[PDB]
Amino acid sequence: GMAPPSVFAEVPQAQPVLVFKLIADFREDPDPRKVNLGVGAYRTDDCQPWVLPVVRKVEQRIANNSSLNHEYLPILGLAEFRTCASRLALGDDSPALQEKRVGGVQSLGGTGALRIGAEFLARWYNGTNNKDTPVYVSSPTWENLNGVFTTAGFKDIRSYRYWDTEKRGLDLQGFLSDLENAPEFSIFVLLACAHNPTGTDPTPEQWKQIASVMKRRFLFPFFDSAYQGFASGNLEKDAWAIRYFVSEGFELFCAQSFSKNFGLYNERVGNLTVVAKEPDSILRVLSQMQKIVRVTWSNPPAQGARIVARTLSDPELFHEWTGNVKTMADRILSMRSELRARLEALKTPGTWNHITDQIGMFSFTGLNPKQVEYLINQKHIYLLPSGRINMCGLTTKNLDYVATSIHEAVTKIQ
Amino acid sequence: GMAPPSVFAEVPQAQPRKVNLGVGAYRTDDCQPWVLPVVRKVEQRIANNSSLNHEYLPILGLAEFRTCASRLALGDDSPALQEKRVGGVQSLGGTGALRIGAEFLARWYNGTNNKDTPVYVSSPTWENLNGVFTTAGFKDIRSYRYWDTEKRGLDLQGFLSDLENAPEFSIFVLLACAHNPTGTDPTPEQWKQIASVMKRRFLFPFFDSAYQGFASGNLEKDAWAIRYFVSEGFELFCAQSFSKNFGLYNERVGNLTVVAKEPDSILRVLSQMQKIVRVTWSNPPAQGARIVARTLSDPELFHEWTGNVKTMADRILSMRSELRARLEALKTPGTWNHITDQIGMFSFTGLNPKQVEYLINQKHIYLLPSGRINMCGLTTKNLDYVATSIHEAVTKI
């Protein structure tokens, strides 16, 4: 007479996600001095989200246009968006665009672009249905990257040396060694500019050395571009490495997000750019991408892509947008400069060059786990166990307290 | 030889008076798309609300959308809702809900990583269903009898026999109403017979509710089968789309409703769904879900929306009654009760593949080799031409 057990009775509870608990603990913390350096998105000097002025303007124009309908977009997405997105990454004068050997697939953010690209490679790259091609990611890398490629079926995910704990910067020699030892045709996922989570990017000359090994060993570049514009407010200058690989003759993928540089996080706007050697393969590659998309999300949403396409295709809106991006980049540069200056004025042990040598909103500070625990529990400054901070969590009002607390952690803990 | 070979060199090219009856979306009597009045109203309200930001939604989606969507499927006073044993995952349309549900089952249902559980779909069914379940890893996709070509209706005895012969715990994907592509639905009495076998043989119902409201013009009636299975104690999934009943095709608004025996199972299931979503689309878009949540949460807007849905369903009913009457007035061979017995946007005309070619080649009327037409492609202006061209097709080829 007993009720049968649920068909879900043996489904385990998934492991807790650290950063969600961190944000939860931050919000309940009563202390008026508390600071959230674990936030994952842009914030103003008043600790607020920022809807870009150009985005509000385009949203109003869309709302006032009654002729726009809601009929399905093409499987591959809105044509003007795909063209504009690939042109943003590659440059108007890209030889690959001139030679008609570029494809673009609209995707559900950068995540969706990585996922479709991984699914394609696991079916059609380095053989048919080859799940064994090594996929290399940086140590450390974006937190969801391993899961995307594992879910696409890749059985051999590897790391390359990248963050050097002692030097607080790039381990160039370790990275180059790991490239030299990678099996021919291995896939390397390369974060393009503003490395998340460390902030450490190769310089252009270091990128040339990386590219040289990849060219020689036939290693496939899969760029992940989520912060174009955050290094300088100059969208062209910030894409230098992707463009250098194109001009060196590489075929490559580039997963693009518009979540951060348009602030369109919750409209899920991305694009997968494909650069091929010959124009005829783009049609074939895209036909397979269509089949992958069809069984994942069918076709992509319109609102965010419409905003991006309208902005990138109109000179006036494009100029306003580049100014909005520069506002974000400049605030981050300011917080980096101000934090470093204060840490040095307090004569904090260690070197702090990395605070301004790093690029973008995320910084590996070099603080150890015990020091992170001190900052959270004693000073109410919330950050990840890795020592990652978001520079947008710093403000004119909290900078002295944050710098003083870091000085305490460095001198009194460990 | 000259250059390094392309890494894409071996990628295959994937396989591929006038009236258009091949459309798959609602169209007006003037052959135009229709943004629903309630949707325009809510869009203007959203555009006027400057407090809305663009920060990421939760992985599982906007909470009020998930609650309102599951309530639409299950009913506001569903015992499963009052007992707190329902979960909802916002998804990228109905397709995304089906995919997330398939990924979950292929990992956690009927064992761990059991890719061998049979997955049954109707003959015929929605053309993308096989691809969704195959991509999730299922190796054994089967069909159950459904369309009876001779009777032009449901082959109940074949369906029941295929249920009886299905291995215990097999998954059945059940189109909940307004069957795509046949327009043939089980009656409530037939649904009860289907449920009885599934209960006895532990068969898992995976409902697909993409046309709630189009079957009858009434959202409550069209969800009856889902709610009946809930009342019979089933655990189940229901993949919901808002593409058709809100006309929000290109905003990709769906929800996966999960019904379990108890609340703790919902918590564990949702925790695994979060992992699946995170590596597929990260978190879902806001615009379409905000429109649906705003509409369903406001009794005034809900009422207006149900009126908009009934306008669409009534125009379809008009086209069905007209086409059958005009065909029967022309003394067309065969019975044509199925044109009005069928339900939803589509009709399996019962027209053989070689009468299709005539309609396309000789009379410029476009439809699928299966004989499916979208009733939203018929208008007051083309009805007499289509009914005459079908008359000729049947009396001639």
Ordered by where they begin, the domains of chain A are 17-50+330-410 (no CATH), 51-329 (3.40.640.10)
Contact residues, chain A, for B60 at CB < 8 Å: none
Rg (CA), chain A: 22
Contact residues, chain A, for B128 at CB < 8 Å: 294-295, 298
Identify whether the C-beta of residue A85 lies closer than 8 Å to the C-beta of residue A273: yes
Which amino acid belongs to residue B391?
H
Alpha-carbon gap, residue A61 to A307, rounded angstroms: 9
Contact residues, chain B, for A56 at CB < 8 Å: 50
Alpha-carbon gap, residue B221 to B216, rounded angstroms: 7
Alpha-carbon gap, residue A402 to A25, rounded angstroms: 18
User: Between chains, do B204 and A278 touch, taking CB under 8 Å as contact?
Assistant: no
Where do runs of H (alpha helix) occur along A190-345? 204-217, 240-247, 279-294, 303-313, 315-345
Measured in angstroms, the resolution is: 1.4
| DSSP string covering B57-123 | PPTT--HHHHHHHHHHHH-TT-HHHHTT-EEEEEEEHHHHHHHHHHHHHHHHSSSSS---S-EEEEE
List the one residue out of B51, B46, B53 whose CA is nearest residue A49: B53
- Environment class of A278 (CB within 10 Å of its CB; exposed 0-12, middle 13-18, buried 19+): middle
Alpha-carbon gap, residue B2 to B19, rounded angstroms: 52
Three-state DSSP at A342 gives: helix
For residue B7, give how far its alpha carbon lies from the nearest alpha carbon of chain A (Å). 7
A-B C-beta contacts closer than 8 Å: 213
User: Between chains, do B25 and A265 touch, taking CB under 8 Å as contact?
Assistant: no
User: Between chains, do B287 and A297 touch, taking CB under 8 Å as contact?
Assistant: no
Contact residues, chain B, for A287 at CB < 8 Å: 12-14
Give the annotated binding-site residues of A for L-aspartate: 40, 142, 196, 388
Phi, psi angle pair for B190, to nearest 5°? -70, -40
DSSP state of B3: S
- Environment class of A368 (CB within 10 Å of its CB; exposed 0-12, middle 13-18, buried 19+): middle
Residue A183's CB is within 10 A of a number of other CB atoms, namely 15
User: Between chains, do A268 and B251 touch, taking CB under 8 Å as contact?
Assistant: no
Identify whether the C-beta of residue B244 lies closer than 8 Å to the C-beta of residue B71: no
Identify whether the C-beta of residue B89 lies closer than 8 Å to the C-beta of residue B142: no
The structure tokens listed for A164 are 């050097």
Contact residues, chain B, for A51 at CB < 8 Å: 53-54
Residues with Cβ within 8 Å of B299's Cβ and at least 6 positions away in sequence, in order, are none
Set B155, B244, B305, B363: catalytic member: B244
B283 assigned ligand-binding residue: no
DSSP state of A152: T
- Which residue carries 């250098």 as its tokens? A244
Alpha-carbon gap, residue A235 to A254, rounded angstroms: 15
Identify whether the C-beta of residue B325 lies closer than 8 Å to the C-beta of residue B367: no
Identify whether the C-beta of residue A276 lies closer than 8 Å to the C-beta of residue A254: no
Alpha-carbon gap, residue A129 to A193, rounded angstroms: 31
- Choose the closest CB to A266 out of B54, B260, B280: B54
Alpha-carbon gap, residue A297 to A133, rounded angstroms: 26
User: Between chains, do B287 and A268 touch, taking CB under 8 Å as contact?
Assistant: no
Residue A67's CB is within 10 A of a number of other CB atoms, namely 5
Alpha-carbon gap, residue A122 to A128, rounded angstroms: 8
The structure tokens listed for A62 are 């869309």
Beta strand A252-257 with A269-275 is antiparallel
Identify whether the C-beta of residue B274 lies closer than 8 Å to the C-beta of residue B91: no
Q: Which residues pair with B374 in a beta bridge?
A: B346
The structure tokens listed for B268 are 């564990």
User: Between chains, do B261 and A5 touch, taking CB under 8 Å as contact?
Assistant: yes
- Choose the closest CB to B9 out of A109, A281, A288: A281
Residues with Cβ within 8 Å of A377's Cβ and at least 6 positions away in sequence, in order, are none
Q: What is the dihedral of CA A34, A35, A38, A42, to 10 degrees?
A: 140
- How far does Cα A408 stand from its chain's mean position? 32
End-to-end CA distance of chain B: 57
Set A142, A163, A321, A352: catalytic member: A142
Technique of determination = X-ray
Residues with Cβ within 8 Å of A207's Cβ and at least 6 positions away in sequence, in order, are A240, A241, A244
Q: Which residues pair with B141 in a beta bridge?
A: B119
Alpha-carbon gap, residue B73 to B238, rounded angstroms: 8
Identify whether the C-beta of residue A220 lies closer than 8 Å to the C-beta of residue A125: yes
Q: What is the dihedral of CA A242, A248, A252, A256, to 10 degrees?
A: 10
Residue B148's CB is within 10 A of a number of other CB atoms, namely 16
Nearest residue of B to residue A15 by CA position?
B271
Identify whether the C-beta of residue B211 lies closer than 8 Å to the C-beta of residue B243: no
Q: Which residues pair with A106 in a beta bridge?
A: A271
Alpha-carbon gap, residue A408 to B91, rounded angstroms: 46
Rg (CA), chain B: 22
Alpha-carbon gap, residue A280 to A277, rounded angstroms: 9
Alpha-carbon gap, residue B230 to B233, rounded angstroms: 5
Instruction: Find which of B38, B55, B85, B265 to mutate to test the A interface (most A CBs within 10 Å of its CB).
Output: B55
Identify whether the C-beta of residue A252 lies closer than 8 Å to the C-beta of residue A94: no
Contact residues, chain A, for B92 at CB < 8 Å: 108, 296-298, 301
B126 assigned ligand-binding residue: yes
- Choose the closest CB to A277 out of B6, B96, B269: B6
- Which residue carries 């806001």 as its tokens? B286
Active site residue B126: yes
User: Between chains, do B271 and A299 touch, taking CB under 8 Å as contact?
Assistant: no
Distances, alpha carbon A160 to alpha carbons A197, A318, A339, B279, in Å: 15, 37, 30, 22
Beta strand A388-390 with A381-382 is unpaired
Identify whether the C-beta of residue B84 lies closer than 8 Å to the C-beta of residue B105: no
Which amino acid belongs to residue B130?
N
**Continuous segment of H or E residues that includes residue B240:** strand B236-241
Three-state DSSP at B176 gives: coil
List the one residue out of B347, B392, B381, B389 whose CA is nearest residue B364: B389
Residue B181: cis peptide before it, omega within 30 degrees of 0: yes
Q: Residue B299: CA atoms inside 13 Å, Cβ hemisphere, count?
A: 1
- Choose the closest CB to B279 out of A151, A266, A304: A151
- Environment class of B48 (CB within 10 Å of its CB; exposed 0-12, middle 13-18, buried 19+): exposed
Phi, psi angle pair for A235, to nearest 5°? -65, -40
**CB under 8 A, 24+ apart: contacts of B354-363:** B354/B397, B355/B393, B355/B394, B355/B397, B357/B397, B358/B392, B358/B393, B358/B396, B358/B397, B359/B389, B359/B390, B359/B393, B363/B17, B363/B389, B363/B392, B363/B393
Three-state DSSP at A266 gives: helix
**Continuous segment of H or E residues that includes residue B39:** helix B37-47
Identify whether the C-beta of residue B378 lies closer than 8 Å to the C-beta of residue B319: yes
Q: What is the dihedral of CA A347, A351, A357, A358, to 10 degrees?
A: -100
Question: Would you put residue A387 in left (φ > 0), alpha (ψ -120 to 50) or beta?
Answer: left
Active site residue B244: yes
Residues with Cβ within 8 Å of A173's Cβ and at least 6 positions away in sequence, in order, are none
Contact residues, chain A, for B53 at CB < 8 Å: 49, 51
- Choose the closest CB to B47 out of A63, A251, A283: A63
For residue B192, give how far its alpha carbon lies from the nearest alpha carbon of chain A (Å). 21
For residue A165, give how far its alpha carbon lies from the nearest alpha carbon of chain B (Å). 29
- Choose the closest CB to B250 out of A277, A296, A301: A301
Angle, nearest 10°, between helix axes A204-217 and A240-247?
40
Scored b (16 or more CB within 10 A) or e, B96-131 reads bbbbbbbbbbbbbbbeeeeeebbbbbbbbbbeebbb
Residues with Cβ within 8 Å of B31's Cβ and at least 6 positions away in sequence, in order, are B20, B377, B379
B374 assigned ligand-binding residue: no
DSSP state of B335: -
HEC string of A275-291 equals ECCCHHHHHHHHHHHHH
Identify whether the C-beta of residue B201 lies closer than 8 Å to the C-beta of residue B166: yes
Phi, psi angle pair for B161, to nearest 5°? -65, -40
Residue B395's CB is within 10 A of a number of other CB atoms, namely 11
User: Between chains, do A56 and B50 touch, taking CB under 8 Å as contact?
Assistant: yes
Identify whether the C-beta of residue A358 lies closer than 8 Å to the C-beta of residue A170: no
- Choose the closest CB to B53 out of A49, A72, A300: A49
Alpha-carbon gap, residue A67 to A85, rounded angstroms: 24
Three-state DSSP at B171 gives: strand
Set B126, B147, B224, B336: catalytic member: B126
Distances, alpha carbon B265 to alpha carbons A47, A236, B262, in Å: 38, 50, 6
Alpha-carbon gap, residue B229 to B199, rounded angstroms: 9
Active site residue A93: no
Phi, psi angle pair for A389, to nearest 5°? -120, 155
Alpha-carbon gap, residue A71 to A299, rounded angstroms: 11
**Continuous segment of H or E residues that includes residue B43:** helix B37-47
| DSSP string covering A10-52 | TPPPPPPPHHHHHHHHHHH---TT-EE----S---TTS-----
- How far does Cα B325 stand from its chain's mean position? 28
User: Between chains, do A144 and B278 touch, taking CB under 8 Å as contact?
Assistant: yes
Contact residues, chain A, for B243 at CB < 8 Å: 72
User: Between chains, do B281 and A112 touch, taking CB under 8 Å as contact?
Assistant: yes
User: Between chains, do B248 and A147 touch, taking CB under 8 Å as contact?
Assistant: no
